[PDB]
Write a protein that binds this ligand. Structure first.
Ligand SMILES: Cc1cc2nc3c(=O)[nH]c(=O)nc-3n(C[C@H](O)[C@H](O)[C@H](O)COP(=O)(O)O)c2cc1C
Ligand SMILES: Cc1cc2nc3c(=O)[nH]c(=O)nc-3n(C[C@H](O)[C@H](O)[C@H](O)COP(=O)(O)O)c2cc1C
Lengths: 187, 187
């Protein structure tokens, strides 16, 4: 083992957050870690829009709910008509990770960046979670108008988001185990 | 800074490899790191097929060339008719990372796993590179027959591969810099 290997195993998806905002230096380190992810052809066409403002996060969540309210999926209409659903779990920071959809691997660039950010965050004692609700909603007219106002490029799609914060006091995680049999070694 | 942050910045794509195979314990640590990646809904539907046999790697590369020889893309026909092209750069190990294509985020699961593996490898002094040539070729009949024989599930597509090895003696990398302006912070 080593610190990297242990941080990789220790990374978890956290869905309950303290109100305290993370420090600017930590946010910069986490975003830089995403920036250093591999990208196809070294295109670096991604954008990372770190939203740290509680009012704007709440407004964006309302727009996402509004998009869901338009859906036929029962689970999605239920979110859309909820008075409590918050896709980012009241994390104080959400990083919207977007890319142009030109290359077929566009989302994999983003996932690499996102995984770096999770690991960077874990190494700094900062909880994180993948927030996926902008993938299918980013082209809803009201959601898109909101994203544009935040600085997400209009020609980008949103491939994933990163919630960041401190784990809520007394929030306990399920013990992690992984599926045996995902690995084949051919000698 | 910390070891995780530094390992993240230090990770590079390496395309020249020594002949020495990596140690079994390192390979297991790297694969475990992939296994601990986040996956949508915790489905863990991915498979990791670590191919450590030079003969089989060469045969697989021939099949990939054969698929490319069928293409119209000039760059791909050139690879297909090459006597020297090797998509995995003669790395002693290639990990084929596959998933069922049921969910739209299938490839992002794989990219998360792959990024963990890169970082795990870097932390152990093991060079790595994303090898993308099975994404568009995995359903070619001869390539697919080969993948099946290696143990890649027949219902999976290949979203990315990881070359692993030691960097060739005297192989020098271009200094890494990242694009300024990919980050927007909204306070
Ligand atoms: C592509 C993808 C999308 C995900 N989307 C969400 C999501 O929108 N909301 C959420 O709470 N967790 C999301 N997750 C987190 C997974 O549920 C989590 O990784 C899985 O349950 C394993 O738990 P762990 O991260 O603690 O290892 C997503 C993960 C992946 C990789
Ligand atoms: C989705 C994706 C696909 C890639 N495919 C290949 C490839 O097939 N062959 C290769 O040599 N490098 C591949 N790369 C590596 C990129 O070229 C590399 O990440 C980029 O040039 C930045 O260099 P660095 O990894 O040293 O930071 C791929 C990277 C990404 C994320």
């Amino acid at each position: 083992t080593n610190e990297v290997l242990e941080t990789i195993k220790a990374r978890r998806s956290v869905r309950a957050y303290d109100r305290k905002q993370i420090p600017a230096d930590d946010l910069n380190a986490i975003l830089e870690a995403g920036a250093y992810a591999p990208s196809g052809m070294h295109y670096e066409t991604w954008h990372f829009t770190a939203v740290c403002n509680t009012v704007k996060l709440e407004e964006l969540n309302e727009r996402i709910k509004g998009a869901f309210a338009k859906s036929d999926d029962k689970h999605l209409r239920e979110r859309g008509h909820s008075e409590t659903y918050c896709c980012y779990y009241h994390a104080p920071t959400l990083v919207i990770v977007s890319n142009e959809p030109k290359q077929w691997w566009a989302g994999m660039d983003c996932a690499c960046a996102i995984e770096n950010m999770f690991l960077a965050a874990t190494s700094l004692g900062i909880a994180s979670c993948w927030i996926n609700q902008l993938g299918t909603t980013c082209d809803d007219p009201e959601v898109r108008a909101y994203l544009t106002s935040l600085g997400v490029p209009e020609n980008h799609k949103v491939y994933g988001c990163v919630a960041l914060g401190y784990k809520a006091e007394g929030a306990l995680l399920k013990e992690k185990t992984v599926k045996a049999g995902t690995i084949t070694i051919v000698e």
